[PDB]
Write a protein that binds this ligand. Structure first.
Ligand code: NA
Ligand code: NA
Lengths: 58, 58
């Protein structure tokens, strides 16, 4: 239901990303959640909700 | 270089997401950028930087 508008162009850097143009309108998915891209100890990469992770102090 | 720690478990909902467990340590990729998942007018889905889009008021 939530529509967003591109403020700037973005050229996708990876196949999971999307190319967008300034002023393009898009559906915002996943209840408007913010994501971080992470890599685990087995070298698998993917997106997780940014609220579920925090920087480590060590 | 930046390591994050899972605060909670997360079960991935899509193949682009990652399953993580509480207390797991992960590499944070993409200069710690936040992402939104969007769908365009051609029904292609992907992640874009959340700073590059904003909610539309119409
Ligand atoms: Na966080
Ligand atoms: Na934004």
């Amino acid at each position: 239901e939530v529509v967003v508008v591109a403020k700037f162009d973005y050229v996708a850097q990876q196949e999971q990303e999307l190319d967008i143009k300034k002023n393009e309108r898009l559906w915002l998915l996943d209840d408007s959640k913010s994501w971080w891209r992470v890599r685990n100890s087995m070298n698998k990469t993917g997106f997780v909700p940014s609220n579920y992770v925090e920087r480590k102090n060590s």
